[PDB]
Amino acid sequence: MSSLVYIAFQDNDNARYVVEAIIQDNPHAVVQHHPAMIRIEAEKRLEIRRETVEENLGRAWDVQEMLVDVITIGGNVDEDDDRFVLEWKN
């Protein structure tokens, strides 16, 4: 009842509020920023396999598009050999 994470993103000006109505739809999603970007928070840990690192690999040529909008997830990022996992982590 404490370990929490957080993910954020900064799209244009409307698409953002849209995702805001979705997270609010759930009576658990948290909120942090509003005007500038839209951050998020969770309460536990996260885990991802190398399969995802494979997608970003073929999509690593989108950094320019990642510049305009902002991105954030969980909070930290622990990686072992090829797999990738991240939980609350302050």
Write out the residue range of the structural domain in which residue 78 sits.
1-90
Q: What backbone phi and psi angles, to 5 degrees, belong to 21?
A: -70, -30
Two tokens, residue 39: 């951050």
* Residue type for position 33: H
Two tokens, residue 26: 């759930």
- Residues in the chain, how many? 90
Handedness of CA 72, 40, 36, 33 (dihedral sign): negative
Number of domains in the chain: 1
Q: What is the CATH number of the domain that holds 51?
A: 3.90.56.10
Distance, CA of 45 to CA of 84 (rounded, Å): 12
